[PDB]
Each structure stands twice: as structure tokens, then as C-alpha cells.
Amino acid sequence: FPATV
Amino acid sequence: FPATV
Amino acid sequence: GAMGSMERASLIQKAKLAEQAERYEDMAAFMKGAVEKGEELSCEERNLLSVAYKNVVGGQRAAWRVLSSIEQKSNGPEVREYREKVETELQGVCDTVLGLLDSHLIKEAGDAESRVFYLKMKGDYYRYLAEVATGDDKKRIIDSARSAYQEAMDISKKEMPPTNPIRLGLALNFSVFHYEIANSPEEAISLAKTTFDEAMADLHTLSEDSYKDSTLIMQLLRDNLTLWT
Amino acid sequence: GAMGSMERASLIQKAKLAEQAERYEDMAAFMKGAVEKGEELSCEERNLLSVAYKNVVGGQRAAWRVLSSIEQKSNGPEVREYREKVETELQGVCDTVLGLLDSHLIKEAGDAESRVFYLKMKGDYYRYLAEVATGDDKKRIIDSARSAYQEAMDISKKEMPPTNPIRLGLALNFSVFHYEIANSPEEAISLAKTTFDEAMADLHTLSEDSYKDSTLIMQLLRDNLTLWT
Numbered sequence: 345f346p347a348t349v
Numbered sequence: 350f351p352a353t354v
Numbered sequence: 355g356a357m358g359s360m361e362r363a364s365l366i367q368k369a370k371l372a373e374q375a376e377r378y379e380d381m382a383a384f385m386k387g388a389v390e391k392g393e394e395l396s397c398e399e400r401n402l403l404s405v406a407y408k409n410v411v412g413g414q415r416a417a418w419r420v421l422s423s424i425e426q427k428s429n430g431p432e433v434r435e436y437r438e439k440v441e442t443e444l445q446g447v448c449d450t451v452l453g454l455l456d457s458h459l460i461k462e463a464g465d466a467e468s469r470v471f472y473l474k475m476k477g478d479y480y481r482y483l484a485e486v487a488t489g490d491d492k493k494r495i496i497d498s499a500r501s502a503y504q505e506a507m508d509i510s511k512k513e514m515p516p517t518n519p520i521r522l523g524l525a526l527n528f529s530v531f532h533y534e535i536a537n538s539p540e541e542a543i544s545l546a547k548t549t550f551d552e553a554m555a556d557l558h559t560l561s562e563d564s565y566k567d568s569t570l571i572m573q574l575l576r577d578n579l580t581l582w583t
Numbered sequence: 584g585a586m587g588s589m590e591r592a593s594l595i596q597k598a599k600l601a602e603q604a605e606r607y608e609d610m611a612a613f614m615k616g617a618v619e620k621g622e623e624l625s626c627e628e629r630n631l632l633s634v635a636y637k638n639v640v641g642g643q644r645a646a647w648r649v650l651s652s653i654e655q656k657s658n659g660p661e662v663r664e665y666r667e668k669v670e671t672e673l674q675g676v677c678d679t680v681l682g683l684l685d686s687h688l689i690k691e692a693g694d695a696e697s698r699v700f701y702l703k704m705k706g707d708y709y710r711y712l713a714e715v716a717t718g719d720d721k722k723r724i725i726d727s728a729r730s731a732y733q734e735a736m737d738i739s740k741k742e743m744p745p746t747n748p749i750r751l752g753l754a755l756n757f758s759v760f761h762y763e764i765a766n767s768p769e770e771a772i773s774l775a776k777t778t779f780d781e782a783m784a785d786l787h788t789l790s791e792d793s794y795k796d797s798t799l800i801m802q803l804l805r806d807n808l809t810l811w812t
């Protein structure tokens with residue numbers, strides 16, 4: 345899964 | 350903390 | 355509001371305690387109560403709001419993915435029912451957050467900083483709704499997320515430097531939205547790359563505190579770019 | 584019971600799904616519903632019950648410790664209030680579990696295996712109540728935990744081999760009770776050591792599956808003995 349903040 | 354199961 | 359009788363300051367204090375205790379549902383309930391007092395949230399308070407609900411909905415999304423995978427493999431009613439249960443609970447958290455933003459955090463955000471922060475959140479929670487949506491409602495949710503994200507981008511580019519961590523986090527997440535939600539992987543790559551490069555070119559203006567902040571998110575931009583190219 | 588209208592088999596199935604999704608509150612609610620159907624729990628089902636509530640109360644205990652530490656350092660009402668809130672929620676989970684055991688899991692457990700399992704749980708949940716109790720109620724809770732644990736020990740020694748993982752886990756936890764709750768560190772050391780040695784001397788009777796089970800808990804006995812000596 346790609347990173348999010 | 351000591352281990353418990 | 356079950357938090358309506360508690361002082362605003364006490365709710366902020368307890369949100370910070372809940373965070374130390376990794377009690378993120380409590381944390382989110384406290385910050386909802388704080389928001390419903392009707393005063394604007396400070397930068398620290400916005401972070402407390404965002405952290406609490408990101409953790410809550412994060413756990414629901416992780417659960418939903420596990421159950422959806424199990425559902426897709428099995429394809430009795432139980433797997434579907436329980437996925438639907440988690441899904442409904444996730445949609446209710448997203449509706450709660452969007453409701454706070456719409457009543458009335460966004461309209462009362464009189465700064466670029468605070469309005470971008472809330473508009474990014476709006477895109478995130480529509481994004482999370484999109485992840486579980488499955489029809490003509492899916493398309494409206496997708497467009498609503500894009501519109502929220504793009505408005506935040508427009509403001510952020512006019513009013514914040516390219517190393518601002520909220521601008522950076524916005525672009526990071528909007529980029530993931532393009533890749534994972536909008537089936538626009540080229541857009542996702544172009545946004546992450548341009549964001550990374552423009553931040554790198556601005557690092558020379560930063561104190562040591564700000565440098566750490568911006569480079570932390572630049573790392574995430576590169577991690578995604580490394581996945582996608 | 585909010586779970587009263589769901590089939591027993593569906594509740595077990597969903598408990599297993601909740602576990603895969605790390606949804607331990609759901610898991611515990613499902614197993615409570617299963618228990619309230621009034622039929623006995625299988626070995627796997629007892630494990631599902633125990634795992635769910637151990638995770639739930641585990642998170643509450645971890646939170647309570649963090650807040651209690653903060654409380655003791657600060658010694659407004661907020662820290663105390665919020666610790667008390669978590670504490671009350673923890674006591675309610677413990678009361679729920681003890682209520683299931685008392686109505687009517689323990690009396691309907693017609694095997695040594697199942698009765699020891701439930702009596703160990705009873706000692707554990709009284710132990711967790713003891714951790715937060717602070718008076719003459721503390722002494723009654725402590726004695727109730729010891730009595731439950733000791734009855735389970737008596738049965739386990741008569742009816743289970745020294746490598747049985749429920750016997751081993753019982754002794755492990757009873758030992759921690761002595762060390763941490765009862766201010767009886769000598770008792771705790773003697774029980775863990777005797778339990779470890781008698782299990783080691785029995786490993787030669789085990790298949791490869793059972794060997795793995797028993798050695799896993801022997802590891803925990805040694806870890807505690809290494810802390811305490």
C-alpha cells in the first residue's frame with residue numbers, strides 16, 4: 345500500500 | 350512486564 | 355454531544371492523554387467534542403483531530419481489506435455480512451468527519467493554513483468512502499474528493515512554500531488518490547515527482563526543525579515513486 | 584443480547600473473521616454471544632473466547648498503566664478523570680467475563696480440560712481487577728483470584744500431564760499473580776521453576792506438534808524466571 349499522511 | 354498467556 | 359458538558363480545554367488535554375495511551379477512539383471522540391465547541395482549532399489541535407481519526411479509520415480500512423479479500427476468495431452470508439458491518443461503521447466515521455468539516459470547520463477557517471488542512475482532510479475522507487463505494491455513488495464520491503484536493507492544492511500553491519508539511523502531505527495523498535482511486539497513475543507520478551523536486555529545491559531556506567519536517571514527507575513521496583516507476 | 588438473534592455457528596465464524604481483521608472488540612462480542620447460546624464451548628472456541636478478551640483487556644491495561652504513570656507524576660482533575668474512565672471500562676470488561684464464567688461456563692464444564700481453562704480465566708480476570716483495586720475490596724479480589732487459580736492447579740495436576748499447554752499457561756499466570764499481585768515473589772519463582780522442570784522432564788513423551796506447544800510456554804516461564812532471579 346502506498347504512503348499517506 | 351512479565352509474560353502471561 | 356456526549357462531550358457537550360466537558361470544558362474545551364479539558365477535552366484537548368484528554369485527547370492528548372488518549373494519544374499517549376493509544377486510545378484513538380477516545381481521542382477522536384474528545385476532538386469531536388472540541389470541534390463542536392465552535393471555536394477554531396489551532397495547528398496543534400488540527401493535528402490532534404487528524405491523528406485521531408486517521409488512526410480510527412485506518413484500523414477500519416485495514417479490517418475492511420482483510421474481509422474483502424476473504425470475501426473475494428469465497429466468491430454462507432457471514433463474510434459479506436461482517437464486511438458490510440465494518441464498511442458501514444467506516445462510512446459512519448467518514449460521514450462524522452465530513453460533517454465536522456462541513457459544519458463548520460471549513461467555512462470558519464479564515465487562514466490559508468487552516469483551510470488547506472481541512473480541505474485535504476475532506477479529500478482524504480471522500481477518498482476513504484471511494485475505496486468502499488461500488489456504483490454511480492462511487493463516481494460522485496471520486497469527483498468530490500478530487501474537487502476538495504484540487505481546491506486545497508490551488509490555495510497551498512498560492513499561500514504556502516513548497517516545503518510546507520501540510521502542502522507536502524496534501525500532494526502525497528492527492529497523488530495516491532490519482533493512483534489508487536482515479537485510475538490516473540500518470541497524474542499520480544507527475545504530482546509526486548514535481549512535489550518532490552520543488553521541495554528539494556527549497557530545503558536551503560529551512561531551519562533545522564523545518565528541514566526535518568519536510569524531508570520526512572519527501573521520503574514518503576520517493577517511496578511511492580519507487581513503487582510506481 | 585445484541586447477538587441473540589444470530590446463529591451460534593455464524594457467531595463463531597464471525598469471531599474467526601474478526602480475529603483475522605484484528606477486530607478484537609467485535610471478536611469478543613461475537614464470542615460473548617456464542618457463550619450466551621448456552622452450549623458448551625469446544626477447545627477451539629475457548630481459545631477464541633480467551634484470545635478476544637485478552638486482547639481487549641490487554642489494551643485497556645496498557646492504557647491504564649500509561650495514565651496511572653502520568654497521574655502519579657502529576658501528584659486539574661483531567662488525568663484522574665480519564666484514568667478512572669478507562670479503569671471503569673476495564674472493570675466492566677472483567678465483570679462481563681466473570682459473569683460468563685459464573686453464568687454458566689464453569690458449572691457446565693463437565694471435563695477437567697474445560698473447567699481448568701475457565702478457572703484459569705477466572706483467576707486472570709480477578710487478577711486484572713486486582714491490578715486497579717485500591718482497598719479492602721483489593722484484598723477480597725486478591726483472595727478470589729488465588730482461590731480460582733489454586734482450584735485450577737489442583738484439577739490440572741490430577742488430570743493433565745505436566746506439558747499440557749493449558750496447565751502450563753495456568754502456572755505461568757498464577758506465578759505472575761504471586762509475583763506482581765500477592766507480594767509473594769518466592770512463591771512465584773518456586774512455581775515457575777517447578778513447572779518448567781516438570782514439563783522439561785515430560786517433553787520426551789510428546790509428538791512434534793505437542794512439543795512445539797509446550798516449549799512455547801516453557802520459554803515464557805524461563806523469561807520470567809530470568810527477570811526474577
Ligand SMILES: N=C(N)c1cc(-c2ccccc2)c(CNC(=O)c2ccc3c(c2)CCO3)s1
Nearest residue numbers: 348349370373396397398399401402405570571
Ligand atoms: N500530538 C500530535 N500527534 C502532534 C502535535 C503537533 C503539534 C504540536 C504543537 C504545535 C503544532 C503541532 C504535531 C505536528 N505534526 C507532526 O509532527 C506530524 C504530523 C503528521 C505526520 C508526521 C508528523 C510524520 C508522519 O505524519 S503532531
Ligand SMILES: N=C(N)c1cc(-c2ccccc2)c(CNC(=O)c2ccc3c(c2)CCO3)s1
Nearest residue numbers: 349397398401518519520523564567568570571
Ligand atoms: N508553517 C509551518 N512550516 C509550520 C508551523 C507549525 C506551528 C504552527 C503553530 C504553532 C506551532 C507550530 C508547524 C508544526 N508542525 C506541523 O504542523 C507538522 C504537520 C505535519 C507534518 C509535520 C509537521 C512533519 C511531517 O508532517 S509547521
Ligand SMILES: N=C(N)c1cc(-c2ccccc2)c(CNC(=O)c2ccc3c(c2)CCO3)s1
Nearest residue numbers: 543544546547550551572575576577579580583
Ligand atoms: N514516469 C516518470 N516520470 C519516470 C520515468 C522514469 C524512467 C526513466 C527510465 C526508465 C524508466 C523510467 C523515472 C525514473 N525515476 C525517477 O526519476 C525517480 C524515482 C524516485 C524518486 C524520484 C525520481 C524523486 C523522489 O523519489 S520517473
Ligand SMILES: N=C(N)c1cc(-c2ccccc2)c(CNC(=O)c2ccc3c(c2)CCO3)s1
Nearest residue numbers: 353354599602625626627628630631634799800
Ligand atoms: N483462533 C485462535 N487464536 C486459536 C485457535 C486454536 C485451536 C484451533 C483448533 C482446535 C483447537 C484450538 C488455538 C489453540 N491455542 C494456541 O494455538 C495458542 C493459544 C494461546 C497462546 C499460544 C498458542 C502461544 C501464546 O499464547 S488458538
Ligand SMILES: N=C(N)c1cc(-c2ccccc2)c(CNC(=O)c2ccc3c(c2)CCO3)s1
Nearest residue numbers: 354626627630747748749752793796797799800
Ligand atoms: N490435550 C492437549 N495437549 C491439546 C488438545 C488440543 C485440541 C483439542 C480438541 C481439538 C483440537 C485440538 C490442543 C489444541 N491446542 C491448544 O489448545 C493450545 C492452547 C494453548 C496453547 C497452545 C495450544 C500452545 C501455547 O499455548 S492441545
Ligand SMILES: N=C(N)c1cc(-c2ccccc2)c(CNC(=O)c2ccc3c(c2)CCO3)s1
Nearest residue numbers: 772773775776779780801804805806808809812
Ligand atoms: N531463587 C531460586 N530458586 C533460584 C536461585 C538461583 C541462584 C543460584 C545462585 C545465585 C543466585 C540465584 C537460581 C538460578 N537460576 C535458575 O536456576 C533458572 C533460571 C532460569 C530458568 C530456569 C532456572 C529454568 C527455566 O528458566 S534460581
Ligand SMILES: [Cl-]
Nearest residue numbers: 435436439597
Ligand atoms: Cl455481522
Ligand SMILES: [Cl-]
Nearest residue numbers: 368664665668
Ligand atoms: Cl474522562
Ligand SMILES: [Mg+2]
Nearest residue numbers: 360361362363
Ligand atoms: Mg467553557
Ligand SMILES: [Mg+2]
Nearest residue numbers: 461462463464
Ligand atoms: Mg474565521
Ligand SMILES: [Mg+2]
Nearest residue numbers: 589590591592
Ligand atoms: Mg440456532
Ligand SMILES: [Mg+2]
Nearest residue numbers: 690691692693
Ligand atoms: Mg457439562
